[PDB]
Design a protein around this ligand. Structure first.
Ligand SMILES: [Ca+2]
Ligand SMILES: [Ca+2]
Lengths: 239, 262, 249, 260, 250, 245
């Protein structure tokens, strides 16, 4: 039951005393941040949201305000992922070196915040994963605390828009990021603009491709103005 | 007249019964009864029962079993053999009744062996329907579902596989498996509300009309997939799921004399 | 032989017959025979015949009648009652043979009563044709479909019925009994669909289920018509109106 | 009776008139009477007249001229100012009548000044003007015109008044006529040959064959911006389509017919 | 500075007023004010007022009445005759002002007759209100949308009208005269389309033309309803039923 | 001026040439020149030539051969090796020049060895070793259709596919393999009902150009086209949002 699960989670959390919470802006890291605040108090919980070139400014700006709106002291930290050569040249193991850079910045922040642990929201300690929470359990408990505001747009690293071996630059990341922002504002929350130098290859859930037709010409000109020469739609669909 | 009066009537009605057995579908109506019963009478006096049968999906049973747990109820699986009744097995027009009689005769049997005063279901506006007695409508159950912080119900109604077969067709493990595999395939493409109606060698797919435009990109995959499941012709009902529910005033009434012609 | 040799052969055989009855479908082959008969024997010695029946559309009949008249032929409609032969009514694989025997026996009566020497059809390079003595002069002169296209260009023929009408029999499974009502039901449904902008269409009969076949490349266009087609075909007697996901054939 | 007799009536009627002026649309019926007039009387006794106006496209005018020139007739272009009749300018329901009267009045003036005995049109207001529709006097039907057009080797022939794009009572101007014409031309160039851009002052109501509306979606934004730069504030698409009512079932065809 | 200080200011403002009339929309802002007013002054000192009028739908009214009752307030409906003011009836660009002016004069009349010290609305930190002297305690306490969210969560408030209503006046061109019949015609048309699955929609009135605004991403989905929509809006009184190629908020 | 005078001009020019070799594509323009050549000079003074090459489809070639024989001409196939010129093989913006040179240099030699006075092609109004009689007579696309209808010509190739070279970027080297890959992809797309199509080659990406008014119809074929062009060797199969050209 959920009452049994939350007792386990608070009990496990009650041991830690001082915590630093890696705050995504999603609901699971939202559950940990506000339940940690509930048991240890505002002054013993630090919410950290990472700002970097590989994720959107919107996801960062929404999560920063979402942590205060939960009542936490919140700290922005900026990671320079592109300064790791594995990330900069988009090797297939590059997810490893990026997560190595991220967890050491938060562990380094936890050392100077006098914290006993770094906490994350996976379904570093994932206490939500330890209490056997499902997406259903996190939904009942987050409403149960009156929580209504999370970033339900799950974002991935922009690295996945680039082929292995391609060098990421500030300019081509921005170009890909601006194209996906425009596509999202037309009503397509799940979208990918895959980068192939002068070709943009747009991935959409197949069930949306019919709805998309009315935007064909506007998307063509918009992504061309962002620097692509050819703007195309993958017939295979999203992933 | 107020939501509070309807809820107070329900708490009062529940308190008198003391020990209850809850027929738990997993939909919004029976979750309200299950979470209300636990709150006013406590975990030791409420048994949630979820039916498992050949006429329903494993996902429906498993999704409902896990909600009796997350709401905190003591929950019991009970399996019904609907296919052993000839009315159901040969899908006569009265089979809904014999299905509900066999269902309700098992929960009472369960109510005897746990000492409950009544079996409760979630029917709205020895089986009691407290929401019906408290004058809850579909709007009231939604409001009270928020007042209790309830977020998890089965959002699309799950219905007996019997409704996919014409009256007189005998249900078999093979043709039920065929219908269920076809709907599961369709749902995995992004169509949570779907029906694959069985007409021997013809499959007649019902989709909400607002989704049919999106479906075109899947025509060929759905055709070949349902053909390998045993249908020879895979077709799309032009009337859609729930024909007439969205029409204009002249033609929803002409489709209803059509649907009533049979 | 050359096309000129083939045309002279065809001119001679007609010039020999002096008076003819032409079975006129409207396709290119029967259009060629009809205009060669007129060119060689003149309007007064040629009678064009178009068969009218329950198994073909009124529309195809009117198009053949009017194409025969605009070619300059005297044209005559004749109505055949195909459902009175049980081989056709019971929709067996040999029903086309009994239909064409019924057709050629009506044409011979028309040639007898107008004094023509032969019935002509448009077959190019079939058992009921011979048993009734009709002649296929394009086939005797060794015309192939390219010879027909070639001679039709040289005579300036540009307008024939391109889409070949097929009998409504193909909308019913083999053995299913054809009745006036189930034929009318399918034909009204296909006529309604064609009037919406879908010239090539099949409404397959499955008793209470209608299964619509459309070219896949047109199904996107069809969406705006779902509700009208559903209710229209229901008022024609179908209980369920469906669209084949496989498409045309 | 027979096509040969119908042609005899028409050849006899033409030989009686001796010299004629022919109203030439460019369509098949006026091409037939123009070509029979040439065969029975020759170029010096036949004047083909092609009407130019604000209510038809310049392209239709130029194509009609070339078909009359291609048939071998002496062709005269006369341009009419239809908007100078107030019935036409303000689009009353009888405006078709005053348009045909002004047309037949210029044709009679042309025929009077070139010595023709009659004005001929291709019909299958005239009788106030004295105009003779010889195909109609010979009882020609659409099949007889097509049978005879082939017998004489006619293969090349070609429209509604722009008045039909405007509501009754709406005043036609040079500018709003041009606006409707350019809008329909732009749409035809996107691949939609059958189209109407109905004028409702600041609203454009586009009629399309319903079977094309799915194909049209990829053009929504371009059509909106193109027709706005042509002077409309709102660019809209009629959900009934082109010719509202003709593709529905017997029940909703008698629902949309009652609604008019 | 912090939400706690912002909440303290609002508690203070309410304790000074002692008795209030709350203009209740059903939205998150007016739900916060209604719940803090009930918490600080008690049920008998708070009147929730829900306005019913021709320019908003019966559902928006019935939902707002019912949302105020589930919060635990005494709520009274008051009906306004907006078409009475000629600025509203002939839909001038100033018509928003005369309607909000007529609304605030009804609220003061209710507050005067129940002994309330102020009429409260739900205005936050980002015209005719201050003329009648209504108070916007959320704006005075420096609440932003994030602060309204934080306090709504901490108070267990989860049930509001997440999408707010606009006056049906926006379906009419400036200068067009609103009547009882063409307002109803617009509202039944929009209700019918929403019942097809198009929750965000506008039927703009152009005498005999209906101009439907839809989010462009839904127009592909809409095609299957064309004839049904066309005939239904014709039975509601429009002669031509059209779809704006520009989309929603054209 | 009129179509009658434009046709008389063409009749006289043909009578002056007396014997001609006609470059026959199978389209409407070269179909008009071919029948008018046959009509004025007869089968024995007219040689129809259909070029067969790697840059045009075998389908267009088979139709042309059989269409000219059906028009009543003696027809000759001649095979060109466009890829043997390095300008064409490496797809420079110049390759049209060397392709048009190789084509007319082959056709003049056919005319030399059968003693005809000119090579005729189908260029209209709106390569100097060739006579474009339709262009000299002031034929427009409208004149060609009017004159083609007047003579009962009905059967030509309605869609002029052009050189497959344009499916490759400037600088890309054409191979037998990548040409066959593009040709097979366009053949498949044409067989689904899209006679006007381009599969632009971008190595591992296929970029399909379709007339925009057809893209709605295409949705039902996405997955089949994706898998079929992948089996032909493309890794990503895409649709240009710009449409055809
Ligand atoms: Ca189409
Ligand atoms: Ca959709």
């Amino acid at each position: 039951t959920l009452a049994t699960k939350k007792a386990t989670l608070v009990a496990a959390l009650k041991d830690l005393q001082r915590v630093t919470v890696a705050f995504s802006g999603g609901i699971d890291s939202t559950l940990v941040l506000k339940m940690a605040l509930d048991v240890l108090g505002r002054d013993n919980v630090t919410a950290v949201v990472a700002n970097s070139e590989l994720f959107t400014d919107e996801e960062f700006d929404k999560a920063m305000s979402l942590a205060e709106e939960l009542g936490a002291n919140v700290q922005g930290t900026t990671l320079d992922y592109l300064s790791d050569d594995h990330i900069k040249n988009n090797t297939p193991d590059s997810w490893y070196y990026a997560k190595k850079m991220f967890y050491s910045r938060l562990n380094d922040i936890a050392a100077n915040n006098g914290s006993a642990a770094v906490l994350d929201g996976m379904i570093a300690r994932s206490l939500l994963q330890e209490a056997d929470f499902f997406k259903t359990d996190v939904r009942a408990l987050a409403q149960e605390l009156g929580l209504t505001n999370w970033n339900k747009v799950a974002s991935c690293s922009v690295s996945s828009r680039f082929p292995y071996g391609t060098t990421l630059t500030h300019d081509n990341i921005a170009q890909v990021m601006a194209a996906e922002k425009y596509l999202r504002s037309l009503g397509f929350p799940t979208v990918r603009v895959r980068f192939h130098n002068d070709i943009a290859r747009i991935e959409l859930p197949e069930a949306r491709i019919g709805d998309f037709l009315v935007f064909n010409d506007r998307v063509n000109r918009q992504l061309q103005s962002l620097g692509f020469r050819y703007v195309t739609l993958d017939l295979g669909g999203f992933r």
